[PDB]
């Protein structure tokens, strides 16, 4: 699936499968790509710059209990990305979600679609 995520004053499309996210602005390239995303048509991600989050493949951290975690052991990279995109973990940011196969779009925050 592909996720329209709000980060305050701008939206981004996150594609976990491709490890790519695209920052949308008030420009033609963004509005046309967003239109394709929402309308269930083939999304032309080629006309936007692909970025990815700057967590290391070997991220290690301590929780407040001082318990030690390592990415790929205690938590998978797939599970970490889930915690930023899924309705269960980041509903405060989740504007809309698109099914990759069927191209079916669920819109949560209609007010956040036009930024």
Partner 1 sequence: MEKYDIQSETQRKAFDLMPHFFLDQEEQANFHFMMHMRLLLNAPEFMATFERDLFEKKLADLQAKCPDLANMDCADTFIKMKSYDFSNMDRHTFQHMINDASNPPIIAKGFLNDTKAVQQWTHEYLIEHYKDTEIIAVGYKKLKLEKILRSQLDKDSKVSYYINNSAEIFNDYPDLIDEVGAEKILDLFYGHSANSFSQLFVGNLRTWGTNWHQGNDISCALMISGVKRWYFIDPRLGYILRPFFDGANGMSAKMDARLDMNFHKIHSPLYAYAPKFYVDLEPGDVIFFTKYWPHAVINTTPLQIMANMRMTEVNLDTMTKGKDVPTLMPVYDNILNSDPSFIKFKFDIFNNLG
Which residues of this chain interact with partner 1, rule CB under 8 A?
Answer: 6-10, 12, 21, 23, 25, 51, 53-56, 59, 61-65, 69, 75, 80, 83-84, 89-93
Burial class (CB in 10 A: 0-12, 13-18, 19+), 22: buried
Q: Which is nearer to partner 1, 40 or 91 (CB)?
A: 91
Minimum Å gap between C-beta 61 and partner 1 is 4
Q: Which is nearer to partner 1, 54 or 110 (CB)?
A: 54
Kindly state the tokens that stand for 24. Answer: 């949308």
What stretch of H or E contains 94? strand 94-98
């Amino acid at each position: 699936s592909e996720y329209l995520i709000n980060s305050g004053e701008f939206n981004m499309i996150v594609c976990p499968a491709d490890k790519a996210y695209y920052i949308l602005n008030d420009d033609r390239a963004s509005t046309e790509t967003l239109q394709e995303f929402l309308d269930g048509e083939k999304v032309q991600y080629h006309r936007l710059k692909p970025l990815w989050f700057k967590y290391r493949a070997d991220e290690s951290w301590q929780d407040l209990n001082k318990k030690e975690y390592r990415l790929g052991k205690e938590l998978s990279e797939a599970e970490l990305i889930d915690r930023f995109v899924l309705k269960a973990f980041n509903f405060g940011s989740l504007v809309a979600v698109r099914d990759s196969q069927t191209g079916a779009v669920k819109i949560f925050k209609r007010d956040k679609l036009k930024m």
